[PDB]
């Protein structure tokens, strides 16, 4: 509360560390469904169904331009990519499997880096 704070965590490396996680996600062999925004002109249903599209290139641009105020907002966008994937793609499909794989990959890096 006012004048009552937990000891100050060092957040000075967070930006660099999120960048490194994102590079690792970008270079994973199963990243291909997520590298670029879904083409809303060429994929029927996507625009109407997926209310907040997100992809790795969009996260990179937001990260590089100071649009994440803290590491929780960064994690929310990464998770959005995989939540969108699950909404639109059957679990038993190459893309559906890719999204589960990538979500696991991310969550381990996230825990190991920050928990």
């Amino acid at each position: 509360s006012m004048s009552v704070k937990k000891p100050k965590r060092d957040d000075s490396k967070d930006l660099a560390l999120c960048s490194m996680i994102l590079t690792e996600m970008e270079t994973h062999e199963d990243a291909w469904p997520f590298l670029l925004p879904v083409n809303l002109k060429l994929v029927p249903g996507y625009k109407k169904v997926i209310k907040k599209p997100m992809d790795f290139s969009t996260i990179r641009e937001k990260l590089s331009s100071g649009q994440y105020p803290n590491l929780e907002t960064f994690a929310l966008d990464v998770r959005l990519v995989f939540d969108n994937c699950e909404t639109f793609n059957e679990d038993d499909s190459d893309i559906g499997r890719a999204g589960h794989n990538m979500r696991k990959y991310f969550e381990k890096k996230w825990t190991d880096t920050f928990k």
Side-chain angles (χ1 to χ4, degrees), residues 11-12 14-43:
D11 58 340
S12 61
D14 291 356
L15 183 64
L17 283 163
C18 287
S19 180
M20 293 169 55
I21 296 172
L22 183 58
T23 296
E24 291 166 0
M25 274 190 311
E26 291 164 335
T27 59
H28 192 292
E29 74 163 290
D30 299 341
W32 59 270
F34 314 113
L35 292 173
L36 301 170
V38 175
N39 183 334
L40 303 179
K41 304 175 199 285
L42 308 175
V43 181

Side-chain angles (χ1 to χ4, degrees), residues 54 57-68 73 77:
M54 189 52 56
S57 74
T58 303
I59 295 174
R60 174 66 73 186
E61 182 67 32
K62 285 177 71 167
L63 193 61
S64 289
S65 66
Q67 295 185 57
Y68 293 115
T73 62
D77 271 355

Side-chain angles (χ1 to χ4, degrees), residues 79 82-83 86 98-107:
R79 291 165 181 150
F82 308 129
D83 290 345
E86 282 199 49
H100 287 290
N101 285 357
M102 296 300 308
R103 181 194 300 273
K104 184 85 174 172
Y105 189 71
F106 171 66
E107 294 298 351

Side-chain angles (χ1 to χ4, degrees), residues 1 3-4 10 16-17 22 35 87 96-97 99:
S1 68
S3 309
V4 186
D10 179 8
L17 283 163
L22 183 58
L35 292 173
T87 295
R97 279 182 289 275

